[PDB]
Design an enzyme around this catalytic site. Structure first.
Site, PDB file in Angstrom:
ATOM      1  N   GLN A 144       5.045  17.335   5.981  1.00 14.09           N
ATOM      2  CA  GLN A 144       4.035  16.579   5.602  1.00 14.09           C
ATOM      3  C   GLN A 144       3.042  17.266   4.729  1.00 14.09           C
ATOM      4  O   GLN A 144       2.651  16.934   3.523  1.00 14.09           O
ATOM      5  CB  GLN A 144       2.976  16.140   6.861  1.00 14.09           C
TER       6      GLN A 144
ATOM      7  N   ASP B 240       0.768   1.726  -1.409  1.00 15.78           N
ATOM      8  CA  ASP B 240       1.760   2.108  -0.563  1.00 15.78           C
ATOM      9  C   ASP B 240       1.794   3.204   0.412  1.00 15.78           C
ATOM     10  O   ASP B 240       2.253   3.273   1.397  1.00 15.78           O
ATOM     11  CB  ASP B 240       3.450   2.344  -1.496  1.00 15.78           C
TER      12      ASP B 240
ATOM     13  N   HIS C  40       8.935   0.123   7.535  1.00 18.71           N
ATOM     14  CA  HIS C  40       8.870  -0.782   6.567  1.00 18.71           C
ATOM     15  C   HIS C  40       8.856  -2.367   6.851  1.00 18.71           C
ATOM     16  O   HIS C  40       9.600  -2.970   6.765  1.00 18.71           O
ATOM     17  CB  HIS C  40       9.950  -0.328   5.389  1.00 18.71           C
TER      18      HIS C  40
ATOM     19  N   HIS D   5       3.113  -2.623   7.784  1.00 18.81           N
ATOM     20  CA  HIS D   5       2.985  -1.989   6.668  1.00 18.81           C
ATOM     21  C   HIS D   5       2.538  -2.999   5.274  1.00 18.81           C
ATOM     22  O   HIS D   5       1.694  -2.557   4.419  1.00 18.81           O
ATOM     23  CB  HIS D   5       4.315  -1.293   6.108  1.00 18.81           C
TER      24      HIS D   5
ATOM     25  N   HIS E 135       6.413  -6.330  -1.347  1.00 17.05           N
ATOM     26  CA  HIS E 135       6.758  -5.195  -2.013  1.00 17.05           C
ATOM     27  C   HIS E 135       7.753  -4.570  -1.158  1.00 17.05           C
ATOM     28  O   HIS E 135       8.545  -3.723  -1.800  1.00 17.05           O
ATOM     29  CB  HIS E 135       5.831  -4.225  -2.570  1.00 17.05           C
ATOM     30  N   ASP E 136       7.874  -4.712   0.094  1.00 15.39           N
ATOM     31  CA  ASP E 136       9.159  -4.174   0.741  1.00 15.39           C
ATOM     32  C   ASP E 136       9.983  -5.264   1.563  1.00 15.39           C
ATOM     33  O   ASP E 136      10.631  -5.113   2.595  1.00 15.39           O
ATOM     34  CB  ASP E 136       8.377  -3.128   2.099  1.00 15.39           C
TER      35      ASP E 136
HETATM   36  C1  LIG Z   1       5.530   7.094   2.631  1.00 17.74           C
HETATM   37  C2  LIG Z   1       5.474   8.371   3.387  1.00 17.74           C
HETATM   38  C3  LIG Z   1       6.663   9.352   3.344  1.00 17.74           C
HETATM   39  C4  LIG Z   1       6.345  10.830   3.767  1.00 17.74           C
HETATM   40  C5  LIG Z   1       7.387  11.655   3.436  1.00 17.74           C
HETATM   41  N1  LIG Z   1       5.465  10.923   4.237  1.00 17.74           N
HETATM   42  C6  LIG Z   1       4.426   9.913   4.360  1.00 17.74           C
HETATM   43  N2  LIG Z   1       3.242  10.543   4.980  1.00 17.74           N
HETATM   44  N3  LIG Z   1       4.380   8.719   3.853  1.00 17.74           N
HETATM   45 NI    NI Z   2       6.031   0.203   0.951  1.00 19.65          NI
HETATM   46 NI    NI Z   3       9.363   0.580  -0.817  1.00 18.60          NI
END
Ligand SMILES: Cc1cc(C)nc(N)n1
Ligand code: NI
Ligand code: NI
Length: 330
Positions: free
Chosen positions: A281, A229, A80, A84, A118-119
């Site tokens: 995933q 995002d 973050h 990003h 945003h982060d």
């Molecule tokens: C932001 C995010 C969260 C997770 C669990 N996987 C992915 N690829 N991206």
């Molecule tokens: Ni973000």
């Molecule tokens: Ni966020």
């Protein structure tokens, strides 16, 4: 402590920056990966604001101070972070360029800024953590805890001397844009996404969706924020896979802290459970990313390449699960 402020050398440096000509063409594409161009990230953002909103949308000095101070208020966390932020802003640019006249000048400028911001000041900890261990932020912000902080950090940055890029707006447009930004940032709370997406799907499928209806607009914008995002999942596989390494690096650091507080973390955040990642995933793509880009493509047909890319990455995670991975570098 306090809000960090860029140096004169930093913002003046950005002012003089020119983007290499070869990238002008590439930056337009959804799959563009900012990764190999770190020195150019802030210049890439100026470029996108200039193409989407015009070279006179903001005073250049204020814009460059704003951007370099935004960078300085992202922390050196594995995911973050600044990278990003620019990646999410680039996805927004690509969505807007393909959907340009659906959005007002005020919406485009507000959204590009919202994505960059945003982060802001993320600490590498989830809302789950903050609330479980009653961080002060959770006391102040009972829901959407980090997102309400990111918005607060944005407004703190605008409030720095010479950083208010929105000052020249009419008092009414000024309030409108801050609302656009607040809503957009809050919408990056994935807790909210599930409901939003379900609502949008229904409005689309019954044909009640109406972009002249402010509540509908807000929801579509919300889904655009989610799509941006999560856009790591819409890049070419090797890029998606390296970004996942950074995301989990953050997760496992949080899981470690939970272990020190007597609590076993969710498996996703457990560094002793990396065998479960491929399946995790898969669950994420099936439950979150695929539906997100599916609905976004229904509502904004030009965003279809995001969904195609996300589908290809799902396939790659499936291959991983089956044991078909080829060589990977970290
Ligand atoms: C932001 C995010 C969260 C997770 C669990 N996987 C992915 N690829 N991206
Ligand atoms: Ni973000
Ligand atoms: Ni966020």
């Amino acid at each position: 402590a306090g809000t960090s402020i860029c140096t004169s050398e930093e913002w003046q440096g950005l002012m003089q920056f020119t983007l290499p000509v070869r990238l002008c063409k590439e930056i337009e594409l959804f799959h563009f990966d900012i990764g190999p161009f770190e020195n150019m990230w802030p210049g890439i953002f100026v470029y996108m604001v200039h193409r989407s909103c015009g070279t006179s949308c903001f005073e250049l000095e204020k814009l460059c101070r704003f951007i370099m101070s935004v960078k300085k208020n992202y922390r050196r966390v594995p995911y973050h972070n600044w990278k990003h932020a620019v990646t999410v802003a680039h996805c927004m640019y690509a969505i807007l360029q393909n959907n340009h006249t659906l959005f007002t000048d005020l919406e485009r400028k507000g959204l590009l800024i919202a994505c960059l911001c945003h982060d802001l000041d993320h600490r590498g900890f989830s809302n789950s953590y903050l609330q479980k261990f009653d961080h002060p932020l959770a006391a102040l912000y009972s829901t959407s805890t980090m997102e309400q902080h990111h918005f607060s950090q944005t407004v703190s940055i605008l409030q720095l001397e010479g950083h208010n890029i929105f000052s020249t707006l009419s008092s009414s447009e000024y309030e409108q844009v801050l609302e656009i930004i607040r809503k957009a940032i809050i919408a990056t709370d994935l807790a909210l996404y599930f409901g939003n997406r379900k609502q949008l799907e229904e409005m689309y499928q019954t044909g009640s969706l109406n972009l002249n209806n402010q509540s509908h607009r807000d929801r579509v914008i919300g889904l655009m924020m989610t799509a941006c995002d999560l856009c790591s999942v819409t890049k070419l596989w090797p890029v998606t896979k390296l970004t996942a390494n950074d995301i989990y690096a953050e997760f496992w650091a949080e899981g470690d802290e939970m272990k020190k507080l007597g609590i076993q973390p969710i498996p996703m955040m457990d560094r002793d459970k990396k065998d479960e990642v491929p399946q995790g995933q898969l669950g994420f793509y099936n439950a979150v990313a695929i539906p997100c880009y599916t609905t976004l493509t229904q509502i904004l047909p030009p965003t279809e390449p995001l969904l195609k890319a996300c589908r290809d990455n799902l396939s790659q995670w499936e291959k991983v699960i089956r044991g078909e991975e080829t060589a990977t570098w970290i």
